[PDB]
Design a protein around this ligand. Structure first.
Ligand code: HEM
Ligand SMILES: *[C@@H]1O[C@H](CO)[C@@H](O[C@@H]2O[C@H](CO)[C@@H](O)[C@H](O)[C@H]2NC(C)=O)[C@H](O)[C@H]1NC(C)=O
Ligand SMILES: [Ca+2]
Ligand SMILES: [Ca+2]
Length: 336
């Protein structure tokens, strides 16, 4: 059966080169298989690469984008000029080098580095990984990336054109559980979007629902809203989506189970990884992806706050029974 040069066993011979890029990335790009800034930047990158895909542009006789084709690396010179692609240069160049050095397509590489980065963060599911996307790409059309100051209708329409339902938009946002911002408000560099920027968990959903009480920096930044405790940043699109009637019940259902949240995120991400491709034409190499350590902590309403502080926005389903903590309000340190 197929054992690779290193003795590991896989489903197909096309998977063997990925054990090598797995060692490179873990040792170098992830600095000893860590869950820090490199994993966070790659998650913005996989999204901005795959979402440059528009059926509506195709239908209007215009090039609509190749989707998850790695065009953000190949055509970095035009894509990184886009409003949503700031602060990605250093990460795009380190990935370009692993791509050229191992002979793999940029589109596959972005998807692989996402599944490998996530396995370094506790609580993560094992993402599916498929190989075989062609390395040729055209530059993505401009303006296909949702922005933090857009209304909910604008975000749902763009995402709906790419193929996601309102529920999948909420599911995809579980990645803001491993997140911070650097360019919305530079005065509070790397301010976390939830209290556990290194744990893939339910806290992001709970904490964006909390009453915005605190201005974390000396002034408000682009599309910044008051957050529930010092050090945490709250982005206007995340505040709006937690509260809008079209997405509020899915958002609420994500607050109490890390199992359900992970299951749904893995499904939405498998769908995003093949935008512009035929899944059936790719080779499954998911067994190359290692398991992440399990997260054993239970969901909590932090720092003494209670259900009275969460702005319940699903008129049908009552808010889940989530534990409370007898804390003083936390002050979050920048994400590492
Ligand atoms: C509804 C659309 C979304 C909007 C408007 C949005 C917007 C943003 C913005 C403005 C930032 C801050 C970047 C910075 O200044 O450093 C951010 C960070 C982040 N976003 Fe999103 N996001 C959305 C969806 C997603 C999706 C689907 C993913 C990927 C699965 C993603 C992954 C991340 C991650 C992990 C970070 C943290 C980056 C870091 O800490 O350096 N986002 N997002
Ligand atoms: C994928 O396509 C890109 C070109 O778009 C290739 O990238 C170049 O590779 C050469 C050496 O192989 C480098 O010296 C260039 O600087 C690279 N250009 C860019 C824009 O990165 C890449 O080699 C191709 N990969 C595969 C597996 O065919
Ligand atoms: Ca692309
Ligand atoms: Ca988290």
């Amino acid at each position: 059966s197929v054992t690779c040069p290193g003795g590991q066993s896989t489903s197909n011979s096309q998977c063997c080169v990925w054990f090598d890029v797995l060692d490179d990335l873990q040792t170098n790009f992830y600095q000893g298989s860590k869950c820090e800034s490199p994993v966070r930047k790659i998650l913005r990158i996989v999204f901005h690469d795959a979402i440059g895909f528009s059926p509506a542009l195709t239908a209007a006789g215009q090039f609509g984008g190749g989707g998850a084709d790695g065009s953000i690396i190949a055509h970095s010179n035009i894509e990184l000029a886009f409003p949503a692609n700031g602060g990605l240069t250093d990460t795009i160049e380190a990935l370009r080098a692993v791509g050229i050095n191992h002979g793999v397509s940029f589109g596959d590489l972005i998807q692989f580095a996402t599944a490998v980065g996530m396995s370094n963060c506790p609580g993560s599911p094992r993402l599916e990984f498929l190989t075989g996307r062609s390395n040729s790409s055209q530059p993505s059309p401009p303006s296909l990336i949702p922005g933090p100051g857009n209304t909910v209708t604008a975000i749902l329409d763009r995402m709906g054109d790419a193929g996601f339902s309102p529920d999948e938009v909420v599911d995809l946002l579980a990645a803001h559980s491993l997140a911070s911002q650097e360019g919305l408000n530079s005065a509070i560099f790397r301010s976390p979007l939830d209290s556990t920027p290194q744990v893939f968990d339910t806290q992001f959903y709970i904490e964006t629902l909390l009453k915005g009480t605190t201005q974390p920096g000396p002034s408000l930044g682009f599309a910044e809203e008051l957050s529930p405790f010092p050090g945490e940043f709250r982005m206007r699109s995340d505040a709006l989506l937690a509260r809008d009637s079209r997405t509020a019940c899915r958002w609420q259902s994500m607050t109490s189970s890390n199992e359900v949240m992970g299951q749904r995120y893995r499904a939405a991400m498998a769908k995003m990884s093949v935008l512009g491709f035929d899944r059936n034409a790719l080779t499954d190499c998911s067994d190359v992806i290692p398991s992440a350590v399990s997260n054993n902590a239970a969901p909590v309403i932090p720092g003494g706050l209670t259900v009275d502080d969460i702005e319940v926005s699903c008129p049908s389903e009552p808010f889940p029974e989530i534990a409370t903590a007898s804390g003083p309000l936390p002050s979050l340190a920048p994400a590492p």
